[PDB]
C-alpha cells in the first residue's frame, strides 16, 4: 500500500505476484487541493530538459534558476526543490553563484542546501523548519534519491510548491542497470524503455506527493522539464495527479506557470471551513446510511 | 551619568515652545527643574525599537561599494555583519588601529569565506574561517537537531545502518576523489548553509514530552476533529425601553382625559368634510404685513442674534502671551489632574499630591504676576478663563483636603 | 488565444443577448453580512499597520498595491469615523525592516486623510517588519483602559516577514495584553500571520479583487464581537454643553484654543477641568475624561437593537399588496422582500436603503 | 430639479382640540397653506417635484401622489388628489387608546426612501437636491427616540436637508434634527399668518438659503440625562457593553446585567 504506486500493472510483473485486488482510489474533492503543472518551456522559449546527462548546459540551468526565483517571489512558507543527482545539484548551485542568481533567491527566501552528511542534513532541515515558522521564507533543495525525501515528510505549510527539477534517471550506476534490464527483457517480459520510465516516474512522483496531508492542505507541485508531457512518462504518474493535470497546464511556460500559481494561491487561501465539505469531500454519521452515498462510493473506487 | 540633562536639553532645543514652558515654570520659581523633567516621560523606545536584522545579501545589498575595493560606509551592512559574523566582530576588536584602517580592513574583508565563498589558506580571515568551521562542527557534534524528536533526525532515520560491506549502494561517500572545483562547490554549499543559519539564529535572541508533542502534531488532521470558532457572549438586553426614550429629559406630557379623544374625533370628522377655500380664507393682508414687520430686523423671531461682539484690539502679542500661558497651565493641570483622579491611598502619591499643591499655589502666584505684567497695557482682554481653570484646581485641592480629612 | 469562440448563438437574435446577459450577470455578486445579538467592542482603539514593502509596488491591482490600499484606507477612515465616533485610529507605515508611527492615535479624519494624501508620495523600499510594528502598536496600546477593545489591522502584502527578534514571544505577550490583531493579506496565506490571527483573536483574509477587498475593509468597519476576556468597565464620561459668547460677550472668557489658532470667543467647555475645546467629541487633553455630545452615543445605537432578516421571495406569490410599503411604488421586478414582525412589502431599493443606511424597518416604528 | 417633501403632523386629537377651541386657525387653513406652498413650489420652476405626507396617529399615508376654475392644470389635478386624499383619510378614521400620540419617525422614513427612489429616477445630466419640511403641531412621544435619531442620521448621510415649522409647542428632537442635518427650525408666534412664514423662510431652496437673510439660529440644548432617574447630567458614567448613560456609579450594570469587573 502506498500513496503513489503507478502503474499497478508492473508489481505483479516483477514480484512473481498474483493478487486478489489491484485497486486505485480517485481523489474526490470539493476544492482543487493541488495543481500539477509541467513547466517545460523557458522564458526565452528554451526547451527545459536534462538531456545532457549531468554535463551542464548553461541556458537550461539559467531557466531553472529563473523558475526558482520567480516561484520564490510567489509561493509562501517553504519551497522544496528536488534535483536529479548530488553531482547535478552540486553543479547547479555552483553555477547559480558565478552566474548572478542565488543572491536574489536569498533576497526572497532562505536557502538550505543539502549535503551527504548524516548530521548536516538534519541541521539544515531543523533550520528550514524553524524558518517556515519564524516569519521568513525557507526553501529546501535536495536530491530526489536520498533519505531527505524518503521519511522526512513535508506537511501543511512546510512545502507549498514541490519543484521537481528534471526527470530522475539513474544515470551514474553501472552495468547493474544494464544487467537488470537484460533480465527483465529475458525472463520476465518488461521492456527496456518501459522499466526506465517506470523507475523514473516512481521516484519523481514519490518525491512530489509528500506535500499534501489532508483535504485542507494545498500543494503546488510543479514538474520542470518537457519530458513529463510525453504521454508515457505522464501516463505513469498516479491517477490522483493525472486527474488534476489539465491540458492547458501541460507544457506551460515559466511565467504562465507563475501566473497559474498566483491564481491558485489566491483562490485557495480563503476560508474553506468544515461546512464546505459535508456535501462532497466528507461524511457524517448519517450521511453514510443513505444508499445514494453508497452509489457514490461505488463510483469512486476502481480496480486494475 | 548626566543623561537626563542631555535629554531635557536636546528637547528644549528641538522644541522651543517646550523650552518656553520650562522657563515659565522652573525659572519663574513655581516648581523645580527636576520635577518637571522627571514626570515628563515621552520618547521613543530605541533608535527603531530594534535594528534591521540581516535579511539576506548583507554582503550583496549595495555590494562592496558605498559609491572591487570601493568605499564602505553603509550602516545596515556594517551592523548586519557585526551581528551576523561574530568572528568579524572579534577581528574588529583586534585589528582596529593597532595598525590598519577601515579601507585596508574592509579591503581584506571582501576576501574569501565572506564575499567569494571559497575555502583555502589565505590572509587574516583564515583563522576566522577556522573558528567558523569549529562553530559548524560544534553545531554538528557538540550540538545536534533539537527537534529530532519525531522527525528531521537525518543521521538515524534508518533502523539498520551498516558499513559499506553488505549493501548495494556502498559507493555513496568516497574517501578518494577530492578535486579542486568540486571541493569549492561543496564549500559554497557549506557557506550558504552557515549564512542562512546565522541569519536565523541572529534573528532569534537568547524526553517523551517533545517526542509525543511532535507525534501528536504530525498525525492529526484539521478536518476530522473539532471546529475552529472561539465564542460570542450573548448580549440579551433586559430593559430596552430605556433605549427607546433615551437621555432626553421627561417633557411635560399630560394629555387630558379620554373624553377629549372622543370630542376631538367628533369635531375633526365634522371638520374635514366641508373643505377647499383657496382665495378667501388663507391670508388676511394685515397678518402678512405684521409678518413682514416681524421678519424685518427689528421685530420678533429676529432675536438680535448673530452679533458676536469681539475685542480684537491688540491681537498678535497678546495671542503669543496666551500661547505661553495655555501651554504652561496645560502642563500644570496635566500633572494635577493626571495624578489627582483616583486618590491612590498611600503616602507616596499623597506626597506627590502635596508637591502638586505647592506647584499649584506658586502657579497661582505666577499667573497673578503674569496678569499684572500683561493686562496693565491698554486695559482689555479678560484672562479670567485661566483663572477659572486654576480656581477649579484650587477648589479640587481644598475639596479633596476636606474629603480626606473626613476620611481620616 | 481563441476566446472569440465564447459567443454562441441558437436563434442569434436574442441568443447573443442571452450570452451577453449571462456574461453581465456572471460579472456581479452580492455581499455576505452576519448578524449577532452579542456583546460588541464599541470603544475601539484601532491601529492600522500598512506595508511599505517592496511588494507594495507590484501591479496586481489596477494601480500599484500601495495606491489602491491607501485609497481604500481613506475610504476606511471615512466610514469608520462615520460609524463609530468615540473610537480612534493610528497609522504605521512599516518600511525597511523598521516601523514608523506615521499618524498618532487620534479621533478626527482630517489628520489621517491628510497623512494618507501625503503617503501616496512615498517610496516603498525594503522588506517589512512585523515585530517592530506590533511593538509600537503594543507600546501605545498598553495603557489604554481595559474596556477598550484594542485592535490592530495589518494590511500586509509580502512574504518575507523580516523581524529582528522572536515573534512568538510577542504573540504570547499580546495574547496576555488582551489586544486583538487582524491581518488582511495580499497574494498569499502566510503561516505566521495565520498563527497571529488565530491566537490574538483576529481574522485573516486574502484578496481577490477591488470588490472583495472593499468587502473585507467593510467587514472590519463594524465593531467586532468581544471574547470572554475583555474588561466590561464603566468609563466616566462628560457631556459638555455648547456655549456661545454669553450675552454679546458680556463678561465672557476669551481664549485662544486647546489644540495656528484664532481667538475663540465661545464653544465647548469641559465638566472636569473647565478648559476650552472647539470640536466635540474629543478626549480631554488635560484630564482623562472623554467628552461626548450624545448623539454620538445615538450614532451607534443600531448595533445594540439590530435589524433582522428580510424574507426574500422572487415570485408573484399571493401579493395582494401590489405597492411598496417603503415608498409607494409598483413592484416591476421579480424580487419582493417581506419583513419579519410587521410583514409588510418592500422592493430592492427599499431593501438596500433600509439595510445599509436607515437601519430600521419603517413598519415596526408605526 | 428640486424635491420638497412636506410632512404635516395631522394629529386628529390636537386639531380636534384646536377646532373645539373655536379659534380662527383650524386644520382647513393648515392643509390649504400646505397646498399653496406646494403649488408655489411647482410654480417656481417646471422641473420641481412635490410630495406631501400626512402623519396620522396610526398610519403614514401619503397625500400626494380639465382646468375648470382657471388654475394651471397639473396644479388643479394635484389639488384635487390632495383634497380627496385628506377627505378619505381623516373622515373615515378609527379610535384606539394605547397609541394616541402622533408619530414622526415613520413618515420621515417614507420620505427618505422616497427621495432615494426618486434619485434613482434621475438621469445622468441632471442632479437632485432635496429637503423635508416638517409642519408639527402636536406633542411628540418620547418612546421612539431610538428610532428617531436614526432617520436624522439617514438624512445626515443622504444629504437631505430638514426644515421644521412647529406651530404650538417647541420640540427638542425636531430642533435637534434641524440642527444636525443643516436644515432650519422655526417656532411660529401667531397662527393664521402661517403661509407668509412658509413663502419666505421655507419656500426658498438651498441656493437661496445663502442669499436671503433669515431668522437666526436658536441655540440648541444638548441636554443629557441618565436612564436611571431621568435627571440632567454634566458628568455621567457610560458602560462599554450596554452603551448606556448612568448618573451615579453603581456596582451591577442594570441595562445589560453585566458582571461588572470591579477595580
Ligand atoms: Zn478636563
Ligand atoms: Zn417590520
Ligand atoms: Zn420601494
Ligand atoms: Zn452595561
Amino acid at each position: 500500500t502506498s500513496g503513489t504506486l503507478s502503474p499497478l500493472d508492473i508489481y505483479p510483473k516483477i514480484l512473481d505476484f498474483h493478487p486478489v485486488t489491484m485497486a486505485t482510489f480517485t481523489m474526490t474533492l470539493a476544492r482543487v487541493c493541488l495543481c500539477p503543472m509541467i513547466i517545460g518551456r523557458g522564458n526565452d522559449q528554451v526547451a527545459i530538459s536534462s538531456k545532457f546527462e549531468t554535463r551542464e548546459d548553461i541556458a537550461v540551468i539559467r531557466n531553472y534558476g529563473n523558475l526558482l526565483l520567480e516561484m520564490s517571489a510567489v509561493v509562501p512558507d517553504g519551497i522544496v526543490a528536488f534535483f536529479t543527482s548530488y553531482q547535478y545539484m552540486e553543479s547547479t548551485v555552483a553555477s547559480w553563484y558565478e552566474q548572478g542568481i542565488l543572491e536574489n533567491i536569498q533576497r526572497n527566501k532562505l536557502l538550505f542546501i543539502e549535503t551527504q552528511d548524516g548530521a548536516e542534513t538534519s541541521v539544515a532541515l531543523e533550520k528550514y523548519q524553524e524558518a517556515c515558522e519564524n516569519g521568513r521564507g525557507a526553501i529546501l533543495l535536495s536530491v530526489a534519491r536520498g533519505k531527505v525525501s524518503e521519511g522526512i515528510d513535508f506537511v501543511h505549510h512546510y512545502g507549498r510548491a514541490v519543484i521537481m527539477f528534471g526527470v530522475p534517471y539513474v544515470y551514474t550506476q553501472s552495468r547493474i542497470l544494464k544487467a537488470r534490464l537484460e533480465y527483465l527483457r529475458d525472463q520476465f517480459q518488461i521492456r527496456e524503455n518501459d522499466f526506465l520510465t517506470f523507475d523514473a516516474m516512481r521516484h519523481a512522483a514519490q518525491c512530489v506527493g509528500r506535500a499534501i496531508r489532508g483535504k485542507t492542505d494545498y500543494g503546488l507541485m510543479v514538474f520542470a522539464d518537457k519530458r513529463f508531457a510525453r504521454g508515457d512518462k505522464r501516463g505513469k504518474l498516479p491517477r490522483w495527479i493525472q486527474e488534476h493535470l489539465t491540458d492547458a497546464n501541460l507544457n506551460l511556460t515559466v511565467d504562465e506557470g507563475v501566473q497559474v500559481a498566483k491564481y491558485f494561491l489566491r483562490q485557495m487561501a480563503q476560508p474553506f471551513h468544515r461546512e464546505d465539505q459535508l456535501g462532497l469531500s466528507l461524511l457524517s454519521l448519517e450521511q453514510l446510511e443513505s444508499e445514494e452515498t453508497l452509489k457514490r462510493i461505488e463510483q469512486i473506487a476502481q480496480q486494475l | 551619568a548626566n543623561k537626563e540633562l542631555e535629554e531635557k536639553n536636546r528637547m528644549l532645543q528641538e522644541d522651543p515652545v517646550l523650552f518656553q514652558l520650562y522657563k515659565d515654570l522652573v525659572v519663574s520659581q513655581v516648581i523645580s527643574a527636576e520635577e518637571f523633567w522627571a514626570n515628563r516621560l515621552x520618547x521613543x523606545x530605541x533608535x527603531x525599537x530594534x535594528x534591521x536584522x540581516x535579511x539576506x545579501x548583507x554582503x550583496x545589498x549595495x555590494x562592496x561599494x558605498x559609491x572591487x575595493x570601493x568605499x564602505x560606509x553603509x550602516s545596515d551592512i556594517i551592523e548586519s555583519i557585526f551581528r551576523t559574523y561574530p568572528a568579524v566582530k572579534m577581528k574588529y576588536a583586534e585589528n582596529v588601529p593597532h595598525n590598519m584602517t577601515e579601507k585596508e580592513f574592509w579591503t581584506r574583508f571582501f576576501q574569501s569565506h565572506y564575499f567569494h565563498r571559497x575555502x583555502x589558506x589565505x590572509x587574516x580571515x583564515x583563522x576566522x574561517x577556522x573558528x567558523x568551521x569549529x562553530x559548524x562542527x560544534x553545531x554538528x557534534x557538540x550540538x545536534x537537531x533539537x527537534x529530532x524528536x519525531x522527525x528531521x533526525x537525518x543521521x538515524x532515520x534508518x533502523x539498520x545502518x551498516x558499513x559499506x560491506x553488505x549493501x548495494x549502494x556502498x559507493x555513496x561517500x568516497x574517501x578518494x576523489x577530492x578535486x579542486x572545483x568540486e571541493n569549492s562547490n561543496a564549500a559554497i554549499i557549506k557557506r550558504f548553509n552557515h549564512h542562512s543559519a546565522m541569519v536565523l539564529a541572529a534573528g532569534l535572541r537568547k524526553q517523551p514530552a517533545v517526542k509525543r508533542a511532535k507525534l501528536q502534531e504530525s498525525i492529526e488532521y484539521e478536518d476530522l476533529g473539532x471546529x475552529x470558532x472561539x465564542x460570542x457572549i450573548a448580549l440579551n438586553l433586559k430593559k430596552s425601553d430605556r433605549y427607546y426614550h433615551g437621555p432626553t429629559p421627561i417633557x411635560x406630557x399630560x394629555x387630558x382625559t379620554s373624553q377629549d379623544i372622543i370630542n376631538s374625533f367628533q369635531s375633526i370628522r365634522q371638520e374635514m368634510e366641508a373643505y377647499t377655500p383657496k382665495l378667501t380664507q388663507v391670508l388676511s393682508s394685515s397678518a402678512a404685513s405684521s409678518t413682514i414687520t416681524a421678519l424685518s430686523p427689528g421685530g420678533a423671531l429676529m432675536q438680535x442674534x448673530x452679533x458676536x461682539x469681539x475685542x480684537x484690539x491688540v491681537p498678535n502679542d497678546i495671542q503669543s502671551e496666551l500661547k505661553h500661558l495655555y501651554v504652561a497651565v496645560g502642563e500644570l493641570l496635566r500633572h494635577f489632574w493626571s495624578c489627582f483622579x483616583x486618590x491612590x491611598x498611600x503616602x507616596x502619591x499623597x506626597x506627590x499630591x502635596x508637591x502638586x499643591x505647592x506647584x499649584x499655589x506658586x502657579x497661582x502666584x505666577x499667573x497673578x504676576x503674569x496678569x499684572x505684567x500683561x493686562x496693565x497695557x491698554x486695559x482689555x482682554x479678560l484672562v479670567s478663563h485661566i483663572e477659572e481653570m486654576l480656581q477649579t484646581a484650587y477648589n479640587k485641592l481644598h475639596t479633596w483636603x476636606x474629603x480626606x480629612x473626613x476620611x481620616x | 488565444x481563441x476566446x472569440x469562440x465564447x459567443x454562441x448563438x441558437x436563434x442569434x437574435x436574442x441568443x447573443x443577448x442571452x450570452x451577453x446577459x449571462x456574461x453581465x450577470x456572471x460579472x456581479x455578486x452580492x455581499x455576505x453580512x452576519x448578524x449577532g445579538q452579542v456583546r460588541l467592542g464599541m470603544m475601539r482603539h484601532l491601529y492600522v499597520v500598512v506595508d511599505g514593502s517592496r511588494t507594495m509596488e507590484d501591479q496586481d491591482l489596477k494601480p500599484n498595491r500601495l495606491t489602491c490600499t491607501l485609497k481604500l484606507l481613506e475610504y476606511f477612515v471615512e466610514e469608520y469615523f462615520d460609524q463609530n465616533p468615540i473610537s480612534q485610529i493610528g497609522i504605521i507605515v512599516t518600511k525597511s525592516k523598521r516601523a514608523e508611527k506615521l499618524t498618532e492615535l487620534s479621533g478626527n479624519p482630517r489628520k489621517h486623510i491628510t497623512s494618507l494624501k501625503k503617503a501616496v508620495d512615498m517610496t516603498c523600499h525594503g522588506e517589512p517588519s512585523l515585530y517592530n510594528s506590533l511593538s509600537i502598536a503594543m507600546q501605545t496600546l498598553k495603557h489604554m483602559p481595559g474596556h477598550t477593545s484594542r485592535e490592530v489591522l495589518i494590511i500586509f502584502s509580502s512574504l518575507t516577514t523580516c523581524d529582528p527578534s522572536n515573534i512568538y514571544d510577542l504573540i504570547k505577550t499580546l495574547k496576555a495584553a488582551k489586544i486583538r490583531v487582524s491581518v488582511i493579506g495580499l497574494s498569499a496565506e502566510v503561516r505566521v500571520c495565520t498563527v497571529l490571527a488565530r491566537e490574538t483573536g483576529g481574522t485573516y483574509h486574502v484578496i481577490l479583487d477591488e470588490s472583495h477587498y472593499k468587502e473585507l475593509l467593510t467587514h472590519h468597519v463594524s465593531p467586532p464581537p468581544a471574547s470572554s476576556s475583555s474588561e466590561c468597565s464603566l468609563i466616566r464620561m462628560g457631556f459638555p454643553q455648547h456655549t456661545i459668547x454669553x450675552x454679546x460677550x458680556x463678561x465672557x472668557x476669551x481664549x485662544x484654543x486647546x489644540x495656528x489658532x484664532x481667538x475663540x470667543x465661545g464653544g465647548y467647555f469641559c465638566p472636569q477641568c473647565r478648559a476650552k475645546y472647539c470640536e466635540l467629541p474629543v478626549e480631554c487633553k488635560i484630564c482623562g475624561l472623554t467628552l461626548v455630545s450624545a448623539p454620538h452615543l445615538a450614532r451607534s445605537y443600531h448595533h445594540l437593537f439590530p435589524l433582522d432578516a428580510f424574507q426574500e421571495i422572487p415570485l408573484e406569490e399571493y401579493n395582494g399588496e401590489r405597492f411598496c410599503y417603503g415608498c409607494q411604488g409598483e413592484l416591476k421586478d421579480q424580487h419582493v422582500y417581506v419583513c419579519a414582525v410587521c410583514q409588510n412589502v418592500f422592493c430592492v431599493d427599499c431593501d438596500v436603503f433600509v439595510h445599509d443606511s436607515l437601519h430600521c424597518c419603517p413598519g415596526c416604528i408605526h | 430639479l428640486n424635491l420638497l417633501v412636506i410632512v404635516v403632523d395631522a394629529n386628529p386629537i390636537w386639531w380636534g382640540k384646536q377646532a373645539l377651541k373655536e379659534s380662527q386657525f383650524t386644520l382647513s387653513k393648515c392643509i390649504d397653506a400646505v397646498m399653496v406652498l406646494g403649488n408655489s413650489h411647482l410654480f417656481m420652476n417646471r422641473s420641481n417635484k412635490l410630495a406631501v405626507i400626512a402623519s396620522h396617529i396610526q398610519e403614514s399615508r401619503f397625500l400626494y401622489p380639465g382646468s375648470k376654475d382657471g388654475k394651471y392644470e397639473l396644479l388643479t389635478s394635484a389639488n384635487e388628489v390632495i383634497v380627496e386624499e385628506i377627505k378619505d383619510l381623516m373622515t373615515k378614521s378609527d379610535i384606539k387608546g394605547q397609541h394616541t400620540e402622533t408619530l414622526l419617525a415613520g413618515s420621515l422614513a417614507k420620505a427618505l426612501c422616497y427621495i432615494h427612489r426618486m434619485n434613482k429616477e434621475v438621469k445622468d445630466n441632471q442632479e437632485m437636491k432635496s429637503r423635508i419640511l416638517v409642519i408639527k403641531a402636536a406633542e411628540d412621544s418620547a418612546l421612539q427616540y431610538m428610532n428617531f435619531m436614526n432617520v436624522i442620521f439617514a438624512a445626515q448621510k443622504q444629504n437631505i436637508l430638514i426644515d421644521a415649522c412647529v406651530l404650538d409647542s417647541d420640540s427638542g428632537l425636531l430642533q435637534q434634527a434641524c440642527d444636525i442635518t443643516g436644515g432650519l427650525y422655526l417656532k411660529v408666534p401667531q397662527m393664521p399668518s402661517l403661509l407668509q412664514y412658509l413663502l419666505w423662510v421655507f419656500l426658498p431652496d438651498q441656493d437661496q438659503r445663502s442669499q436671503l437673510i433669515l431668522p437666526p439660529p436658536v441655540h440648541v440644548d444638548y441636554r443629557a440625562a441618565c436612564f436611571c432617574h431621568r435627571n440632567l447630567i454634566e458628568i455621567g458614567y457610560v458602560c462599554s457593553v450596554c452603551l448606556s448613560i448612568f448618573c451615579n456609579f453603581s456596582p451591577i450594570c442594570t441595562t445589560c446585567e453585566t458582571a461588572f469587573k470591579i477595580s
Side-chain angles (χ1 to χ4, degrees), chain B residues 238 242-248 250 264-265 267 269 271-273 275-278 281 283 287 291 301 303, chain D residues 13 16 24 26 28-29 31-32 35-36 83 87 142-143 145-146 187 193 215-216 218 225 227 230 242 255 257:
Chain B
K238 183 178 182 179
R242 292 181 180 179
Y243 286 159
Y244 285 158
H245 54 279
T248 301
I250 295 173
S264 68
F265 179 74
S267 68
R269 186 174 176 179
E271 181 71 23
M272 288 293 107
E273 291 172 352
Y275 186 67
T276 319
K278 298 288 286 184
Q281 195 67 45
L283 280 178
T291 305
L301 297 177
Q303 289 181 353
Chain D
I13 295 95
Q24 185 62 255
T26 64
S28 289
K29 286 191 289 296
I31 309 298
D32 285 332
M35 288 190 289
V36 176
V83 168
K87 288 183 182 180
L143 189 66
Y145 172 76
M146 165 59 75
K187 192 262 191 297
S193 174
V218 187
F227 295 156
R230 306 287 296 171
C242 65
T255 310
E257 288 180 350

Side-chain angles (χ1 to χ4, degrees), chain D residues 130-149:
Chain D
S130 61
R131 61 179 180 174
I132 299 172
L133 188 69
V134 175
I135 297 169
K136 186 174 184 289
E139 299 180 355
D140 49 353
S141 177
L143 189 66
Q144 290 90 16
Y145 172 76
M146 165 59 75
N147 301 115
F148 190 77
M149 276 293 176

Side-chain angles (χ1 to χ4, degrees), chain A residues 139-155:
Chain A
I139 170 172
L140 177 74
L141 58 94
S142 60
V143 186
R145 300 284 180 179
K147 295 180 182 179
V148 182
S149 66
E150 285 187 356
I152 300 159
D153 292 330
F154 297 146
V155 200

Side-chain angles (χ1 to χ4, degrees), chain D residues 40-105:
Chain D
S40 302
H41 175 66
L42 293 174
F43 206 77
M44 286 181 68
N45 197 359
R46 184 176 183 270
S47 295
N48 286 323
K49 296 181 183 180
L50 173 61
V52 171
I53 309 170
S55 175
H56 198 264
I57 47 93
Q58 67 187 0
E59 55 181 356
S60 294
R61 187 175 294 171
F62 286 5
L63 304 179
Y64 181 78
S67 65
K68 293 181 181 179
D69 294 331
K71 296 179 183 177
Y72 177 77
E73 294 175 353
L74 293 175
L75 304 181
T76 308
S77 67
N79 284 316
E80 285 181 353
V81 65
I82 292 171
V83 168
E84 187 65 30
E85 193 67 29
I86 67 166
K87 288 183 182 180
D88 198 359
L89 185 67
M90 297 304 294
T91 60
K92 176 70 175 177
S93 293
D94 298 328
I95 177 168
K96 287 184 179 182
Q98 291 181 357
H99 185 73
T100 189
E101 290 293 328
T102 187
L103 61 96
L104 193 62

Side-chain angles (χ1 to χ4, degrees), chain B residues 16 33 38 42-361:
Chain B
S75 66
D76 294 333
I77 295 173
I78 188 167
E79 291 168 355
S80 64
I81 294 166
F82 185 79
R83 284 184 173 181
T84 302
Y85 297 160
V88 180
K89 174 180 177 181
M90 291 181 68
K91 190 73 171 176
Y92 189 81
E94 291 179 352
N95 293 322
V96 154
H98 285 288
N99 293 319
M100 64 182 70
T101 316
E102 290 179 354
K103 183 68 175 177
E104 183 67 29
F105 176 71
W106 290 95
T107 302
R108 292 173 179 175
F109 175 73
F110 73 92
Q111 296 174 357
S112 67
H113 312 281
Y114 288 149
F115 185 77
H116 294 286
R117 279 88 168 97
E182 303 292 327
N183 198 357
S184 295
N185 301 329
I188 295 171
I189 291 172
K190 294 296 181 183
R191 296 293 176 270
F192 277 101
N193 281 314
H194 178 72
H195 178 77
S196 296
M198 288 299 107
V199 166
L200 182 60
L204 184 65
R205 296 296 181 187
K206 293 182 181 181
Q207 290 178 356
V210 184
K211 293 188 179 180
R212 288 181 186 179
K214 296 293 183 182
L215 285 163
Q216 294 294 324
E217 286 182 355
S218 70
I219 285 167
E220 289 181 354
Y221 294 152
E222 290 179 352
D223 292 332
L224 302 174
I233 294 175
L235 183 61
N236 289 315
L237 298 165
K238 183 178 182 179
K239 294 181 181 179
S240 182
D241 290 332
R242 292 181 180 179
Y243 286 159
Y244 285 158
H245 54 279
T248 301
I250 295 173
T257 310
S258 66
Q259 299 173 355
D260 292 332
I261 296 171
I262 307 167
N263 295 318
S264 68
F265 179 74
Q266 288 167 355
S267 68
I268 203 168
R269 186 174 176 179
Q270 294 179 358
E271 181 71 23
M272 288 293 107
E273 291 172 352
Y275 186 67
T276 319
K278 298 288 286 184
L279 288 171
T280 300
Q281 195 67 45
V282 175
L283 280 178
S284 65
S285 67
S286 63
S289 68
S290 68
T291 305
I292 297 166
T293 302
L295 296 174
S296 67
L301 297 177
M302 188 68 73
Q303 289 181 353
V314 183
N316 296 317
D317 298 330
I318 291 177
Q319 281 172 356
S320 294
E321 288 181 352
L322 294 173
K323 285 180 183 179
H324 287 285
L325 284 173
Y326 280 101
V327 165
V329 178
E331 181 68 25
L332 293 166
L333 297 175
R334 177 182 174 182
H335 293 291
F336 292 164
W337 299 96
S338 182
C339 292
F340 177 77

